[PDB]
Amino acid sequence: GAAGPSSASVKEFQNLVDQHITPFVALSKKLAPEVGNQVEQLVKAIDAEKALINTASQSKKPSQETLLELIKPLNNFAAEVGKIRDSNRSSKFFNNLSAISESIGFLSWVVVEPTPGPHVAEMRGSAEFYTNRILKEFKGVNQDQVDWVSNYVNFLKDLEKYIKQYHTTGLTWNPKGGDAKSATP
């Protein structure tokens, strides 16, 4: 069987953030301002996504109209992520910014059906084109660059497992739930 709507999917998602994203954020600020700024937006998108998962675990699947308003914030941060990287082509951290910008679509797993897991993996494939450049340049020379790459890639790897487990064929909603519309602002 499946887990169904469950506080466990909310808890495990946060465990993924604590494990991979928190140190990622520290490394990011340590690397450079533009990288810290772009990851700061990713974090906001991620936190918004956690809230979406929590709402879905407690609410019935909303109308498509309502479901666009709930992810609008997500889309906005994703947008900022790309703008930052697009305007920093001369940055020595362009590969870092592109690992994220070119895989930001991973956030959209919450509305991809019935293959959200494969969607994140495809996106990870895109970040890796750039994280491989990072490793090629810093493997054995800058462990912080290596650890930055590792936190992100493993975050996406664990995210795919989390999905296969708690939202196999799509974000899990609650048929006997409440109204998502009047969410928890």
C-alpha positions as a printed Julia matrix, in Angstrom:
185×3 Matrix{Float64}:
   0.0    0.0     0.0
   0.74   3.73   -0.12
   1.22   6.03    2.84
  -1.78   8.14    1.85
  -2.12  11.76    3.15
   0.27  11.8     6.1
   2.21  14.05    8.49
   5.12  11.65    7.77
   5.6   13.01    4.25
   5.9   16.5     5.73
   8.4   15.41    8.34
  10.54  13.41    5.89
  10.63  16.31    3.42
  12.02  18.58    6.15
  14.56  15.88    6.99
  15.79  16.18    3.39
  16.11  19.91    3.79
  18.01  19.65    7.08
  20.32  17.01    5.81
  21.25  18.43    2.4
  19.94  21.97    2.06
  21.07  23.57    5.33
  24.76  22.97    4.82
  24.18  23.78    1.15
  23.0   27.21    2.15
  26.07  27.77    4.35
  28.46  26.71    1.6
  26.57  28.89   -0.89
  26.98  32.08    1.11
  30.6   31.15    1.7
  31.22  30.8    -2.04
  29.81  34.1    -3.28
  27.05  36.73   -2.95
  25.28  35.85   -6.2
  25.33  32.18   -5.3
  24.04  32.94   -1.8
  21.31  35.13   -3.25
  20.21  32.49   -5.82
  20.15  29.67   -3.28
  18.2   31.94   -0.91
  15.41  31.96   -3.53
  15.67  28.17   -3.99
  15.25  27.82   -0.21
  12.1   29.93   -0.31
  10.71  27.79   -3.15
  11.58  24.69   -1.17
   9.91  25.97    2.02
   6.83  26.93   -0.05
   6.83  23.39   -1.46
   6.93  21.94    2.05
   3.88  24.02    2.85
   2.15  22.74   -0.31
   2.85  19.12    0.77
   1.46  19.87    4.26
  -1.69  21.49    2.77
  -2.26  18.56    0.37
  -1.9   16.06    3.23
  -4.83  17.83    4.89
  -6.99  19.02    1.99
  -8.95  17.65   -0.92
  -7.47  18.06   -4.4
  -8.44  21.64   -5.38
  -9.85  22.99   -8.65
  -7.18  23.72  -11.28
  -7.79  27.43  -10.64
  -7.15  27.05   -6.94
  -4.16  24.8    -7.71
  -2.55  27.6    -9.76
  -2.78  30.11   -6.97
  -1.16  27.66   -4.48
   1.92  27.2    -6.68
   2.2   30.78   -7.88
   4.71  31.6    -5.15
   6.72  28.54   -6.17
   6.84  29.69   -9.77
   7.96  33.2    -8.76
  11.03  32.03   -6.81
  11.9   29.64   -9.63
  11.79  32.64  -12.0
  14.15  34.67   -9.78
  16.53  31.74   -9.72
  16.96  31.88  -13.51
  17.14  35.69  -13.72
  19.99  35.75  -11.28
  21.94  33.17  -13.19
  21.12  34.7   -16.61
  22.6   38.08  -15.48
  25.79  36.57  -14.11
  27.27  34.89  -17.15
  30.66  36.51  -16.33
  30.64  35.22  -12.77
  33.28  32.69  -11.84
  30.38  30.83  -10.24
  28.26  30.64  -13.42
  28.48  26.83  -13.37
  27.15  26.85   -9.78
  24.3   29.18  -10.73
  23.5   27.05  -13.83
  23.5   23.77  -11.9
  20.54  25.29  -10.09
  18.87  27.38  -12.8
  18.8   24.54  -15.32
  17.31  22.09  -12.83
  14.9   24.45  -11.02
  12.03  22.72  -12.85
  12.49  19.87  -10.31
  10.16  21.95   -8.1
   7.34  21.2   -10.54
   7.11  17.56   -9.45
   4.2   18.61   -7.25
   2.05  18.94  -10.39
   3.57  16.27  -12.64
   1.58  13.02  -12.96
   1.89  10.13  -12.91
   5.72  10.45  -13.0
   6.93  13.09  -10.51
   9.95  11.01   -9.51
  11.23  10.57  -13.09
  10.72  14.34  -13.56
  13.11  15.22  -10.7
  15.66  12.72  -12.05
  15.5   14.33  -15.49
  16.08  17.71  -13.86
  18.98  16.34  -11.83
  20.43  15.14  -15.13
  20.5   18.8   -16.16
  22.16  20.1   -13.0
  24.84  17.39  -13.36
  25.92  18.68  -16.78
  27.06  21.73  -14.82
  27.99  20.08  -11.5
  30.35  17.85  -13.49
  32.12  20.99  -14.74
  32.38  22.11  -11.17
  33.88  18.77  -10.09
  36.23  18.67  -13.08
  37.55  22.09  -11.99
  37.67  21.62   -8.23
  37.88  17.95   -7.41
  40.99  17.7    -5.26
  41.54  21.42   -5.18
  38.55  23.01   -3.48
  36.59  20.69   -1.16
  33.94  23.38   -0.56
  33.04  23.4    -4.26
  32.92  19.57   -4.12
  30.71  19.54   -1.0
  28.4   22.17   -2.57
  27.94  19.86   -5.58
  27.41  16.86   -3.36
  24.74  18.49   -1.09
  22.64  19.51   -4.13
  22.92  16.3    -6.17
  22.21  14.14   -3.09
  19.33  16.41   -2.22
  17.81  15.67   -5.65
  18.71  11.98   -5.36
  17.02  11.7    -1.96
  14.07  13.76   -3.22
  13.41  11.16   -5.94
  13.34   8.43   -3.25
  11.11  10.49   -1.0
   8.67  10.86   -3.95
   8.68   7.18   -4.92
   7.77   6.56   -1.31
   5.2    9.26   -0.36
   3.85  10.63   -3.67
   4.57   7.87   -6.2
   2.11   8.88   -8.89
   1.66  12.54   -7.88
   1.46  14.89   -4.89
  -0.73  13.12   -2.29
  -4.01  14.94   -1.56
  -6.61  14.08    1.09
 -10.1   13.07   -0.29
 -11.61  13.54    3.23
  -9.6   16.7     3.79
 -10.6   20.28    4.21
 -10.48  23.24    1.89
  -6.97  23.92    0.57
  -8.1   27.38   -0.51
  -8.25  28.58    3.09
  -4.75  27.26    3.68
  -2.41  28.27    6.53
  -1.1   31.75    5.54
